Structure 1
Amino acid sequence: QRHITEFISSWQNHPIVQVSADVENKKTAQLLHADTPRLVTWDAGLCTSFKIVPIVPAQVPQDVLAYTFFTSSYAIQSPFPEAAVSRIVVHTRWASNVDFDRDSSVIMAPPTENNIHLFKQLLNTETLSVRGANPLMFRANVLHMLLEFVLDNLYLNRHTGFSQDHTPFTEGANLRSLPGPDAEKWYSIMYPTRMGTPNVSKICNFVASCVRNRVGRFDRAQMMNGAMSEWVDVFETSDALTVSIRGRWMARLARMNINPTEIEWALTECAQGYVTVTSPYAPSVNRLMPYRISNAERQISQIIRIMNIGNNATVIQPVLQDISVLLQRISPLQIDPTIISNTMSTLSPASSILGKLRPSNSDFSSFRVALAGWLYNGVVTTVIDDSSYPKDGGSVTSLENLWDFFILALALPLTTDPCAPVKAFMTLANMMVGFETIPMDNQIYTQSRRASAFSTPHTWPRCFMNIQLISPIDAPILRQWAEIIHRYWPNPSQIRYGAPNVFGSANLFTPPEVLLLPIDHQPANVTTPTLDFTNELTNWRARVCELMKNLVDNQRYQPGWTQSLVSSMRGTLDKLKLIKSMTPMYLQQLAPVELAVIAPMLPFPPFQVPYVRLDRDRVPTMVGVTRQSRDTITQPALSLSTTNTTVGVPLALDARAITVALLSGKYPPDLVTNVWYADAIYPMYADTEVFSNLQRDMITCEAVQTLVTLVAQISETQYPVDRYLDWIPSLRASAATAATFAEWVNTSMKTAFDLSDMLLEPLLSGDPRMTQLAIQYQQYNGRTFNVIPEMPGSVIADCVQLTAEVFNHEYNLFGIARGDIIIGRVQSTHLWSPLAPPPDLVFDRDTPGVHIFGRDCRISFGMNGAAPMIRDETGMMVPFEGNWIFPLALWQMNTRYFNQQFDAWIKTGELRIRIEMGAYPYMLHYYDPRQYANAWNLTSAWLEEITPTSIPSVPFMVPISSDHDISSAPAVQYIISTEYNDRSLFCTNSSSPQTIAGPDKHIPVERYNILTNPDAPPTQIQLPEVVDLYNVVTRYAYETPPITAVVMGVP
C-alpha cells in the first residue's frame, strides 16, 4: 500500500513507483514533499462528544432479584444512569475508536470543577490569574471552541458488522457489534429496550411506554461483501448536528470525485502522443478518486504564491535552477564554441576578441535560465550591466570596443527589457558622438547620457521616438540602423498550453491556454537548411554585420590606425555572420517543444503579462493587489509590490556566454527526438506530484474563505455573516489585536491538521478584515487590467453558522449562563430550587425606585458620626437601603470601595442590588437543605475576587437531590438568579417510579421522540429546541485505487 503510483515501460525494463515521503521505507523510490493532512478517516467508535453523568446512585427494595426462565434466573441491570440528578458532560468523540487522532478532542469537567482555561483559551492568555477571563474575549473564545469541535469531528463512519446476540431477550438476534468490550453495555444504552424492567420505576415506566419499532438496523444494502453490506441504516444514540456536518464534508468529497479515463486522455494530450501509457481501471463499486477542482481556487492560491514570492529573488532562484537542470538534460542539442574556435583555426582583432572571450568555459546555465524567465514573463526581467557596455560609452576608434559592440548588438534583441532598444540606440549614439550627431529634446538628458538611465518609456527621447524627426544626414549610419531595426525587429510569440478537462489554466493577465514567448517560434524540422535568412536571428545577425562593415569601411570612425584592418576585420566578421548556428533554429523549433513538455513539468505555474514589443503606451508599469471590496472607501496604504518599480524580478547575465551559445548549437547526428523526449518524459511523468499540490492548494483555499468570514464574524467587515451571539461579550479590537487573535487561530488550525508548513503567511502580514481581493497592472499610456476571482465557499463556514444557532439554543447545555442575578440574603422553609427562588422576594427589572448609578457618583463619607451617602446617578447621596441596579463594570472599578461602604450592609443589610450580567460561565455546588447554610463568607470572597480587569468564576449553591421528603434547616444565600437554569439536568431520582418529595425531572420525551412518540416519523428532528440523542444513521464502505500507467512505444 506504500506504493501510490506504478509506471512500467514496454521499451525498457525500468518500472518506476512513487510513494509518500512520510513513509519510513524510501528505498529507490520517489517521495511526497508537501505537508498534507488526512482529511478522510474511518471510525470504529461512536461519534459522541456528550455523556450524561448520574451524580448519586439510588436504592429501591425488590423481593425477587432475577427474571424467571426455566430454572435459570436473570439479574436486572439498568442501562440508564442511576442518580438523584443526572446531567450530560462534554468529551468530544468520547465513545469513538480510531488508530488516527484529530488531536482536537474537548473534555468538559463537571460544573463543580473549573474549566476557566477553555473560556480564556484565546486572547485571555494575557490574564493576571488563570482563574478568571476578560468577558470581551468570550465571543472570540466560544467561536474558536466551536471551530475546534468541528475540526475534531472531521471523520467518516466505517460500515461495521452485526452479531448474533446471547442476551436472553434477543438471544440469537443480530446486533451490530461495537468494537471489543462494553458492546452489551453499549447495546443497553442504544437499546435499553433489551434490558427488562420487572420493577416499577420512572425509568421502567418510560421503557414500557417507548415504541418497539424505533430500534435495530433500519436497512442494509442488498449488495454486500462476505457477511458485511456495502452500506447500512441502523438506530443508535447519536447527535444529528455532527452527522449533518460530516454529510457536508462527504458532499464536498462527492463533488471532488474525478475519473481515471479523463486522466489517461489528458496525459496523452500532454505527452502530445509521444508514448502510450496504459491506465485501464477495473471498475470499483466504491471506487473513489477525489480530484475535481476549479481554476478560481488555483487563481487565489497563485495570488498567495505571488505574495509568497514577496520581492524575494532568492526564493525564485531555486525553481529556476531545477528547471534549468531539467532543460540541460532535457535538451539533446550540443553547444560547441570550441568548434567555432577550431573553424577560426586561431596585432589581430580576431586575437583581441579571442582573448576577451576566453571561450573555454562550457557552462550555459544562464541560457536555460533565460528560457525559464521567458516562461515566467510577468515576474521575470532580463537586465544588462552598463559595464557590459563599453567603458566610458566606448570609442569609435577602439577595435576591442568594436568587439563589445558586436556582442552587445547580438544580445540586445535577446534582452527582455522593453526600453532595451532605446538603451542600445543611446549606446551607439554615445560611441558615435563627434562622428554622427543626435538631437536631444531635453537639455537635462545628453547624447552621452548613460542608456541605463533611460530604463523607462517616459524617458524615450522625442528625437529618438520619431526617426524622421532625426536628420538622416545628421546620423546616416544611425538613421539606417533605425530603419533596419524597424524592418527586422524581433517578434515574440504565444503558444497554446494546458488541458481543459482536468488541470486547466487559471491565467488572468494572460490567456489561460496561451503561453507567451519573447521569441517567435516555428514548426520543428531538423532537415531544415542552415542558411535560412527567414529565421529572424539569422537575418538580424546578417544586417548587423553588414551595418558594422559599412561603418568601418572608410576608417573615418577609427583614425590613428597605421594599417588598414578593413580586409581582416571584414573576414572575421564575415566568418561570424556566415556561421550556420542551429541555436536560433533550436530555439525556434526544439526549444518550444521542450518548453511545452516542461510547462506541465513546472511545479509552479509561470506568471506572465501580455508582450508589447513596440507598444510603448501599452507597456505595463507595475502590478498591485487590493484586499477590500469595491464598494468600501478606505485609506490607501503602503504595499510590497509598490516598492519595486520592476514588474518582474531583474536578472543580469553574461552577454558573451549567451551570444557564443547562440553561435554554437548542434543536435546529436543520429538522435531520435521522439525517442529522446519520450525516454526523458517517462521518469518525469512517473515522478509527478501534481495531486498533492492540488490538495494543499484546496486546503489553503478553504482556510482563506473561513478566515475572511470569521473576520466579518468578530469584526466589522463588508462580507455578510449572521451574528446571533453579539450578546456574547466582545470589545472592538485594534486591527493589530484582531491580527494577533487571527494568528493564534491560524497556529491552532495548522496544529489541528498537524501542518508542518506555513499557512497563508503572506496573508498574515495584516489586513485580515479584507472584503474582496483584487489585482491589477497598468500601462505606460496608463491603461490598466484588474483581475478579481469569485469566492469559493468553505464547508467549515456553513457548519459554523449552523453550530452557532445550535449553541444559542443549547448554551445552557453548552454551559454558559445567560442573564443577570440579584443580591439578596434569604432564609426559607419552601422547597423552591436555587434556580427557582420566590419571585416576590426578587425585585423585577420593570420596578419603580430601583437605583442605577452614573459614572460620576463618588460616595459621601461621614467622620465622627457624619453621614456618608452613596452619590446617585442623579447626583443625590443616599443611605444604603432599597433595590438598586448596578452595571457590573462599576463594582469591578470600585470593588474594595463598595465592599468597604456596604460591608456591614452586605453582611446584615437588607438593601438589594441588581448587577447586570447578561451571560457568563457558571459553577454549581450541591448543598444540604436540612443544615444551617451561610454564603456570607463565600459572598465576601467572591466580591473580593471581583476586579476591574475581570470578575471571579460564578459559584452556585444548589441542594443535593433526594427522592423522598426531608427536613430542612436555616440557610443563608445572597445570590439570586433572575431565571431557571436547570434545563441541563437530564432527570431527577429516575430510580423511583414516582417522586416522594422535592423537584421532579423526567427523561425528555422530545429527545427520545422517535421512541416516545409512535406518530413521530423516524427521520423527524426537533432542532434546535430539542436534540434527540439517538437516531437512525447510515454507514457505507468505499474504495480508492492507486495511480498506475503502463507506457508503450507509439507507432
Structure 2
Amino acid sequence: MKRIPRKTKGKSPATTEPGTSNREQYRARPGIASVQRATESAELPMKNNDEGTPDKKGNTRGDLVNEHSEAKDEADEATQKQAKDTDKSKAQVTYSDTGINNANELSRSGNVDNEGGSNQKPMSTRIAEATSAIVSKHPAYQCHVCSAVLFSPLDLDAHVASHGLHGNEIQRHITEFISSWQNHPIVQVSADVENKKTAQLLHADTPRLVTWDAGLCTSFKIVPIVPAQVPQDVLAYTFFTSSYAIQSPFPEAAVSRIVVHTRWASNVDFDRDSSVIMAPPTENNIHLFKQLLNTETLSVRGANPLMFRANVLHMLLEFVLDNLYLNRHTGFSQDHTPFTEGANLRSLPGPDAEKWYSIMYPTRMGTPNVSKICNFVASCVRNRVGRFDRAQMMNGAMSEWVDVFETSDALTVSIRGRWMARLARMNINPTEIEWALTECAQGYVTVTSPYAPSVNRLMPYRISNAERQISQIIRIMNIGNNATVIQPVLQDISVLLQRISPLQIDPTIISNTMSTLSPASSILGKLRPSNSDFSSFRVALAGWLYNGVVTTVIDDSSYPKDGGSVTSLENLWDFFILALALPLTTDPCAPVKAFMTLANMMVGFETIPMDNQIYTQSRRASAFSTPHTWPRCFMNIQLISPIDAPILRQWAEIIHRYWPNPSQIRYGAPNVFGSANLFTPPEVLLLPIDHQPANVTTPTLDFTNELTNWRARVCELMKNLVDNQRYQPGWTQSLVSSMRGTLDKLKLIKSMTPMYLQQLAPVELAVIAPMLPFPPFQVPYVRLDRDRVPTMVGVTRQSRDTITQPALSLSTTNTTVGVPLALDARAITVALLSGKYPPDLVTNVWYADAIYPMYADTEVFSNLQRDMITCEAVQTLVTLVAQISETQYPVDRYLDWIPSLRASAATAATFAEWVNTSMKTAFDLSDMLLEPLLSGDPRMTQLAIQYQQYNGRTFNVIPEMPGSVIADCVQLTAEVFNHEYNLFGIARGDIIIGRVQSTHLWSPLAPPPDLVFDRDTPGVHIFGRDCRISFGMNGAAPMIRDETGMMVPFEGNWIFPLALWQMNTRYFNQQFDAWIKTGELRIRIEMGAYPYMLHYYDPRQYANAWNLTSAWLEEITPTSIPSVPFMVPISSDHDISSAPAVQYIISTEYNDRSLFCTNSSSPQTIAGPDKHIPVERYNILTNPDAPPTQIQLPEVVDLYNVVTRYAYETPPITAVVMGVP
C-alpha cells in the first residue's frame, strides 16, 4: 500500500566519461528566468464565477445587485487591477468608459433565482414560510538515454524508470524536460507539494483518473442480525500435534442479511471519499434518503417522499464514483490446505493475509459439520478458486496482469470494467508526443521522447474534439460579462509575448528623426516618447486570439476634442495617430470610424451626403459602433462628389483600396491534442493582418507590406490636404514646407514594427495558442464586407427539436460581439513607429531559447484530462436531471416507480449542485465544473453555440457528444437497483395497516395472499383528495366520503394514497386510530417505494406492535415520513412454544430479499422463516455448466466472480529538446 493525500475535503574500472566536463559558457537569450516567471502566470486558469449559482441549501450565492450595475462595477474592478498590474495610477487599457455604449450589458448577480424571481428573501426561507401555513397540531553519473547527469547510482535506477528501463526522479515528477545546447533541465511538480525546491509547477486543476485498490472488489457485505451459538460434532482440524480452528465464509448466526457498503474491504492509494455506507436493517437508515431536498423539514427522522427518486438517483451516482478504481495485482501464496490443494490464493497486503482467505474463498473451509453453511460449500466445485489465468509478459518473476476467482460482486466488477476501458482508449505513446510537441514548435526545435518497449505503460491523454468543444463552451459561459475574469488572461499574455519577442520599442528613433507654431514639436508633444508604457500594443495582439468574447477598440478619448477641425494643427495630429492605429483593433467598425473621423473635422470645407434625415455629417465618429450605422456613401464611394468633397473622396478610396487584409495560419497539433476551435477549422488561427514568411533581411521601406504602405498612404493624404492651405485659414505663416517635411519624416521612418507584425508576430502567437489554458475563440474577420460582420454570440441549452422559453445567454447583451476593451491610440502608434530588432539577432537561436523554458512548463496534457471530465460531467447531469423533470431527452427510465415530483428549475438546480460537488470531491477538483450551467433552469438537453451576421444569417455549432462511462454506469447500476432494490434499504409496493393477531410465523415482508387486497378486489373503497368526513350524530356511525361520492362508515378495507394521510395527519390520526387498533378498519397506504426498518422479537413471548405503528402514523408529515417499521420473528433451529403476536403493518409483496440465511450454522430451520444460502448468487460455483466469465446482471448480483487485476506504469512526460541550425 502507498497513499496520496487529498487536496480537497470529501464526504467526511575508470568511470570518468569523456564528455561530462561542464563548460557552461552559455547565457540564454531571452533569459530562462525571464521567460519562466512570464509563462508561470499565463499558466494560471481563469477564476471560478460562483455568483448566480445555488448552494447545497438551494439559495443562490452572490450579492443583491442589479445585473447592469454588477456588469459596471466588475468593469471598474478590472480596469483598476489592470492599473496595479502595470504599476501605474491610471490604467492605459480600460474595461470601463470605452467609447461603446454597453447600456444593456448584464452580469450574473446573486439578486435572482432560477425561476426569474427576486432573492429578496432566500429560497430556503420561502420554502419554509410556504409549508408553515399548511401545518396542523393535536387538539386540546550519466544517462545515455536522455543525457541527463545524475549523482547517485540509486538516483540512476530511480531515474531511468522514466524511460521504461527498470530499476537495475521522484513520482512527484510530471514533466521532465532537458535541452541539448545547455545544461539546464526543467521538471514540473504538483502545485500542492511543500517542496518547490528548484522545481517548476503544474497549476492546472487536474482530476485524478488513475487510482488503485488492492482490496476486494465488492460493495455488499453480509452481516449478522441475530447472533447464535450452537453445539457441533467437529470442533477443529488437527494435524499431528497442531490444530487449526474452523473459519466459516459467512456469519454463524440465526439471521444474516446483505447490506450496501461501498469499499468496505478496499485498500486504496487515493480516497475518492464518496462512500455509500448503510447500516444493518435493525437500525435506522432514513438518513440515506434525505441528504438532498429534505432541508426545510419538520422532523429530524423521516424523509420526504417527493424527493425520493431525486435522492436515490444521487445515491446511485456516489455508488459509482466511489467505485471508480483499477484493480491492483498483489502477490499470492501456494496453498496446501486439503480443501484448496495446490491453489494459488491471492494474498492481500499488510499483516494477517491468511485472515482474509477464509472470506475470499468459501471452498477453503471443509465440510466438517452438518450445517446450512456446509450444505453450500459441499455444493460448490473445488477447481474454481485462486489464480485462474495470467499474463504471458512479466517483469521479474511477476506477471503484468492476472485473472483470479474471489469474493466480489458482479456490479462493482462490471463498473470498474468499463472504467478500465474508457481510460485505455485514452492511451498515447511517447512517439506521438514527439510529433505533437515538435509540430507545435513551428520548427524551431525538435523534441525526442526515448522509451523502451512496453504494453502496460498507461498514458491517458487522448480525447475527441467534440469533447474539447463542449468543454470550452462551458468556459465561455463562465465569463458572463465579468471583465474580472478576462482582465488577467489578456494582460498576463501580453507580458509573455513581450519577453518572448525579439522586437524592441525605442521611441528615441522618433526623437532623432524630428531633430527639434512648430508642426515638428507638436507631434512630439502629442506622442510623448518619454512614456515607456506599451500595454496597449501587446494587449492589442493578445486580443486577436479571443476575438469572440472580447472586442478591442480605441478609447473615445483618443478622438479629437469636440469633433476636431482640419483647421487645428493639433487635431490633424490626432487624426494621424488615430488612423495609424485603428487597424490593430478587432473592432469590426474600425474602417468606418477611420473615415468618419476626418469627415467630422471636414465640416465647413467639404461635404458628404447623409442617407438619414436625422444623423448629420457631424455625428461623432466614435459612435459608429455597429454595422447598421455604416453610411451609404461609405460603401459606394461613387456617391462622394470629387467636387464637393475631393479629400474625403480620396480618404475613402484609400481605405477600401489599402486597409489590411485578414489571413490565417496553421497552429498546434490537431492529431494528438485535438482542437477546441468552434467557428473555425481545427487547425486554423485567424489573423486580421496579412502574414508573410519570416526573413530578417527584409527592407524597412517595403511598400509591399500592407502596414508599411498604410503608414505611407495616410501620410501622403495629409500632405495633399495641407498642400494648398485651403483647409487652414487663420494660419498666418506658410507651414506647408514644415508640415510636409514633418510628414515625410514619419512616412519614411525606419521602424521595423510592421515587418515584425507581419512575419514574427504571427509565428509567436501560433507557438503559444496550444499551450494556453484558455484556447482561442475567434469569429471571422471580414474587412469591408458589411453583411458578413458578426454581431452576436450565444449559447443554447435545449435541443433543436424543441420549442422552449427563449433564454438568451448573457453573452448576447453586449452591443459589440464581445466585452468592450479600450486601447490607447497613442501608445500603439508610437510602437508602430519605433521598433527595432537586436543587431545580433539570429531567429533559429533566439526562438529555441524562447521555447524551451516555455514548453517545459506546459500543462496541455493535464488540461486535456480535465476537458474529458468536464464533458462526462455535463453528459451525466442531463442524464440524471432528465429523470426528475420533464425533459425531451431520450433515456431509459428504470426508477420511475420511486415517487418524485416534477422538479422545477429551482428544484432541479439544487439537485444539480450536488451532482456537481459530488463529482468534484470524487476527482479531487477544486475549481469550476458545471457551475456556469447552474445559473438558470439546468433542465437542459444539449449544449451548442452560435453567432449571427448583420444580414441575419447565423452559424450554429452543435458538438456531437460521444459516450459517458459515468453516465452509463449510473444507469447500469440503476437497472440493477430495479431488482436488488431491497439490498439498498428500499422496499417496493405498498403497505397495509390493520390488526392481525395470530401465532403463525410468516414474515411480514412476505405475507400470505389473503391478507392483502387491491383496487380490483370486491368490497373495497378507494379514496381521493375529497375525503370529507362527517361525524356520527346520536349513535350513528361517522362516515368518510368515497371516491365515487358515497359516504361509508369506518370499517372494511380502504385504499389511501399516502398523500391523503400527509395532508390530514392530525385529523385522520384522531378519527381513525381507535378503529384501526381494536376495530375492523384496515387501510392500504399506496406508497410506491419506501425505506423500511426491522424489529426482531422472540416468537415465544407476547408482542404487540401497536406502539411502533402508532408512532409511525403519529410522525407522518406533509414533509416527512419515517421508515416503515416491521416486526419479524426470530427463526429457530429447534422446536419452540408459541405465543400470540399482534401486528399492524405488513408488506404487499415480497421484500425480504436482503435475507441471506437463517440458522446458518445449524442443520435446518424448524420454526419461522427458513432461508437457505442463495445459490443463485454463487453461480460460477454452484452450477458446473456455467462458464467462468458468466454474470447474471441485471437481475442477480453474483457475490463471487472472476476479477482481472493489473499493474501498470505511469511515467512522466519526458522530452529532449534539440536545436535547429
State the TM-score, normalized to the length of structure 2. Answer: 0.83
Q: 1:388: Cα distance to partner?
A: 1.8
Greater Cα shift, 885-894 or 756-765: 885-894
Q: Distance in 2 between matches of 1:18 and 1:179?
A: 32
Tell whether the 8 Å contact from 1:700 to 1:760 is kept in structure 2 after alignment: yes
Decide which of 519, 522, 525 is 2:692's aligned counterpart: 522
Deviation of 1:968 (Å): 1.2
| Range with greater deviation from structure 2 (801-810 or 82-91) | 82-91
State the distance in 2 between where 1:763 and 1:772 align. 11
| 1:899-924 Cα deviation digits (max 9, x unpaired) | 33334323321232322233211111
Aligned residues of 2:1057 and 2:1086 also touching (Cα < 8 A) = yes
- Check the 8 A contact 2:553/2:585 in 1, yes or no: yes
Instruction: Judge which range, 744-753 or 377-386, deviates more.
Output: 377-386
Cα deviation, residue 979, structure 1: 2.8
Q: Counterpart of 1:866?
A: 1036
Query: Deviation of residue 76 (structure 1)?
Result: 3.7
Q: Is the 8 A contact 1:498 1:512 kept in 2?
A: no
With over 3 angstroms needed to count, the CA separation of the structure-2 counterparts of 1:670 and 1:803, relative to structure 1, is: same
Contact 1:963 1:998 in 2 (8 A): no
Instruction: From the superposition, tell whether residues 496 and 184 of structure 1 become closer, same or farther in structure 2 (CA, over 3 Å).
Output: closer
CA-CA distance at 1:34 after TM superposition: 1.8
| Residues 15, 965 of structure 1: alpha-carbon distance in 2 compared, 3 angstrom cutoff | same
SS at match of 2:1002: coil
Q: Work out the CA distance in 2 between the residues paired with 1:600 and 1:195.
A: 61
8 Å CA contact retained: 2:1092, 2:1123: yes
Which residue of structure 1 lines up, in the alignment, with residue 737 of structure 2? 567
- The Cα offsets for residues 103-142 of structure 1, whole Å up to 9 and x where unpaired, read as 1122211112111111111111222112111111111111
Which whole-Å CA distance do the structure 1 matches of 2:571 and 2:217 have between them?
Answer: 81
Is the CA contact 2:667–2:767 (under 8 Å) kept in the aligned structure 1?
no
Q: Name the SS for the 1:163 alignment partner.
A: strand
State the Cα distance separating 1:40 from its structure 2 match: 1.3
In the TM superposition, what whole-angstrom CA distance separates every residue of 1:570-595 from its partner, at most 9, and x where no partner exists?
22222122212211112121222222
Change (3 A) 1:415 1:809: closer
Displacement of 1:1025? 3.1
Tell me the secondary structure at the aligned position of residue 31 of structure 1: strand
Worse-superposed segment, 814-823 or 716-725: 814-823
Q: Structure 1 CA distance, aligned partners of 2:223 and 2:771?
A: 59
CA-to-aligned-CA distance 1:934-955 (integer Å, 9 cap, x gap): 2233333222222333333211
SS of alignment partner, residue 108 of structure 1: coil
Q: How far apart in 2 are the matches of 1:58 and 1:857?
A: 50
Structure 2 equivalent of residue 829 of structure 1: 999
Query: Could you list the per-position Cα deviations for residues 15-53 of structure 1 after superposition, in whole angstroms to 9, with x for gaps in the alignment?
Result: 111112122211122111122232211222112221112
Secondary structure class of the residue paired with 1:68:
strand
What is aligned with 1:251? Answer: 421
Say which SS state the counterpart of residue 827 (structure 1) adopts: strand
Tell me, yes or no, if the aligned pair for 1:601 and 1:684 is still in contact at 8 Å. no
Deviation digits for residues 530-568 of structure 1, max 9, x if unmatched?
A: 222222233223232222222222222212223211112
Q: Does the residue aligned with 1:1046 lie in a helix, a strand or coil?
A: strand
Q: Distance in 1 between matches of 2:271 and 2:1176?
A: 33
State the distance in 1 between where 2:656 and 2:380 align: 94
In 2, Cα distance between equivalents of 1:371 and 1:899? 75
Secondary structure at 1:820 match in 2: strand
Residues 227-285 of structure 1: CA deviation (Å, up to 9, x unaligned): 42211122111101111111111101111001111211222222233233332212224
1:830: Cα distance to partner? Answer: 3.2
Q: Distance between the aligned counterparts of 1:316 and 1:71, measured in 2? A: 80
- Give 1:999 shift: 3.4
Question: In structure 1, the residue corresponding to 2:365 is in which secondary structure?
Answer: coil
Kept after mapping to 1: 8 A contact 2:371/2:1164:
yes
Question: Does the aligned pair in 1 maintain the 2:986–2:1089 contact within 8 Å?
Answer: yes
Question: Per-residue deviation at 1:60?
Answer: 4.2
The percentage of aligned residue pairs carrying the same residue is 100
User: What is the SS of the residue equivalent to 2:1083?
Assistant: strand
Q: 1:848 to 1:278 in 2, by over 3 A?
A: closer
Q: Tell me if structure 2 keeps the 8 A contact 1:22–1:32.
A: no
Q: 1:619 to 1:981 in 2, by over 3 A?
A: closer
Alpha carbons 1:854, 1:874 under 8 Å: kept: no
Structure 1 distance, partners of 2:552, 2:1072, is 81
CA contact (8 A) 1:374 1:380 kept: no
Residues 524 and 856 of structure 1, relative CA distance in 2, 3 Å threshold? closer
Describe the shift of the 1:421–1:1000 C-alpha distance in structure 2 as closer, same or farther (beyond 3 A): closer
Partner in structure 2 of residue 463 of structure 1: 633
Q: Report if the CA contact (8 A) 2:189-2:202 is conserved.
A: yes
- Residue number in structure 1 paired with 2:1141: 971
Say which is worse superposed, 728-737 or 487-496, in terms of deviation.
Answer: 487-496
Label 1:592 to 1:68 Cα distance change in 2 as closer, same or farther (>3 A).
closer
Deviation at residue 190 of structure 1 after TM alignment: 2.8
**1:862-888 CA-partner distances (Å, limit 9, x unpaired):** 355455333333444333222222222
**d(CA) in 2 for partners of 1:74, 1:505:** 64
Distance 1:610 1:338 in 2: 37
- Check the 8 A contact 1:116/1:130 in 2, yes or no: no
Query: Hey, what's the Cα distance between the residues in 2 that align with 1:17 and 1:1041?
Result: 13
Shift of 1:191: 2.8
Aligned equivalent of 1:102: 272
The alignment partner of 1:803 has SS state of: helix
Deviations along 1:698-719, whole A, 9 cap, x unmatched?
Answer: 1111101111111222222222
> 1:224-243 to 2 correspondence within 5 Å?
224-243=394-413
Secondary structure of the corresponding residue to residue 924 of structure 1: strand
Residue 59 of structure 1 deviates from its aligned partner by 4.2
The offset of 1:156, in angstroms, is: 0.8
Give the CA deviation at 1:57.
Answer: 4.1
| Distance in 2 between residues matched to 1:868 and 1:590, nearest whole Å | 95
Alpha-carbon distance in structure 1 between the residues aligned to 2:887 and 2:659: 52
User: d(CA) in 2 for partners of 1:71 and 1:777?
Assistant: 87
Q: Please say which of residues 339-348 and 299-308 is displaced more in the overlay.
A: 339-348
Q: C-alpha separation between the residues in 2 aligned to 1:1030 and 1:311?
A: 55
Mapping 1:56-75, distance limit 5 Å: 56-62=226-232, 65-67=235-237, 69-70=239-240, 72-75=242-245
Is 1:859–1:868's contact at 8 Å kept on the other side of the alignment? yes
Query: 2: distance between equivalents of 1:846 and 1:385?
Result: 79
Q: For the residues of structure 2 that align with 1:901 and 1:40, how far apart are their CA atoms? A: 61
Q: 1:614 to 1:165 in 2, by over 3 A?
A: same
- Distance in 2, Cα, partners of 1:843 & 1:460: 79
Alpha-carbon offset, residue 336 of structure 1: 1.8
Query: Which of 273, 294, 298 is residue 124 of structure 1 equivalent to?
Result: 294
| Partner residue, 1:408 | 578
Structure 1 residue 475: deviation in Å? 0.8
Per mean C-alpha deviation after superposition, the further-off stretch among 917-926 and 310-319 is 310-319
Checking the alignment, whether the CA contact within 8 Å between 1:627 and 1:767 is kept in structure 2 is no
Query: Contact 1:377 / 1:516 at 8 angstroms: preserved in 2?
Result: no
Q: Which digits, 9 at most, give the CA deviation of each residue in 1:505-538, with x for residues without a partner?
A: 3323223222211121222222222222222233
For residue 465 of structure 1, report the CA deviation from its aligned partner.
3.0
Q: 1:589 to 1:59 in 2, by over 3 A?
A: closer
Distance 1:405 1:443 in 2: 27
Give the direction of change, closer, same or farther, for the CA distance of 1:938–1:208 in structure 2 (3 Å limit): closer
In the other structure, the counterpart of 1:806 is 976
1:626-672 residue CA offsets vs partner (Å, 9 max, x unmatched): 11111111222343022102113323222222212211111111111
1:147 CA drift (Å): 0.7
Shift of 1:303: 1.1
The answer to which of 299-308 and 940-949 deviates more is 940-949
User: Does the aligned pair in 2 maintain the 1:964–1:998 contact within 8 Å?
Assistant: no
Per-residue CA deviation, residues 282-317 of structure 1 (Å, 9 max, x unaligned), is 222411111111111111111111111211233222
Q: Note if contact 2:586-2:688 (Cα within 8 Å) is conserved in structure 1.
A: yes
**1:740 is matched with which residue: 910, 929, 944?**
910
TM-score normalised by the chain length of structure 1: 0.96
Q: Which moved more, 1:492-501 or 1:143-152?
A: 492-501
CA contact (8 A) 1:60 1:992 kept: yes
Evaluate the alpha carbon distance shift between residue 88 and residue 483 of structure 1 in structure 2; reply closer, same or farther with a 3 A threshold.
closer
Does the 8 A contact of 2:546 with 2:778 survive in 1? Answer: yes
Note the aligned Cα RMSD (angstroms): 2.2
Q: Deviation of residue 841 (structure 1)?
A: 4.6
Tell me whether 587-596 or 62-71 shows the greater mean CA deviation.
62-71
Q: 1:727 to 1:318 in 2, by over 3 A?
A: same
Provide the C-alpha distance between the structure 1 equivalents of 2:512 and 2:744, rounded to a whole number of angstroms: 16
Q: How many residues get paired?
A: 1051
Q: Which stretch shifts more, 378-387 or 604-613? A: 378-387
C-alpha deviation, 1:423, in angstroms: 2.3
Distance of 1:939 and 1:9 partners within structure 2? 78
Equivalent pair of 2:173/2:189 in contact (CA under 8 Å): yes
Residues 1023 and 1043 of structure 2 are in contact (CA less than 8 Å); yes or no, is this contact kept in structure 1? yes
Indicate which of 397, 412, 435 corresponds to 2:567: 397
Farther-moved stretch of structure 1 (338-347 vs 662-671): 338-347
